Amino acid sequence: MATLLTTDDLRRALVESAGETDGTDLSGDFLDLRFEDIGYDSLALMETAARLESRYGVSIPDDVAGRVDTPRELLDLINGALAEAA
């Protein structure tokens, strides 16, 4: 819906949950850059998604929140959630 996250928005969330960072290699489309490769553990990732959950009034299944290997999956998952929630 209007509520949607693009790669740029998704980047922002990981920047926010990482704290004071430059955003490393999340520049542009990092959808193919795996979380393990950007030093992002599923726990941190859940917190990232958590910010998004709270912000967009959604809830992401705890299995799926740490089931995503690549940002593309996570982006799509939230896109599908935000398809219904706004």
Which method was it determined by? Answer: NMR
> How many Å separate Cα 38 from the centre of its chain?
13
User: What's domain 1-86's architecture?
Assistant: Orthogonal Bundle (1.10)
- What are the DSSP calls for the chain, one per residue? --S---HHHHHHHHHHHH-S---TT-SS--TTS-TTTTT--HHHHHHHHHHHHHHHT----HHHHTT-SSHHHHHHHHHHHTTT--
Spatial contact of 46 and 35, defined as CB atoms under 8 Å apart: no
CB atoms within 10 A of CB 42: 16
CA triplet 33, 17, 78: central angle to 5 degrees?
Answer: 65
How much is the CA Rg of the chain, to the nearest whole Å?
A: 12
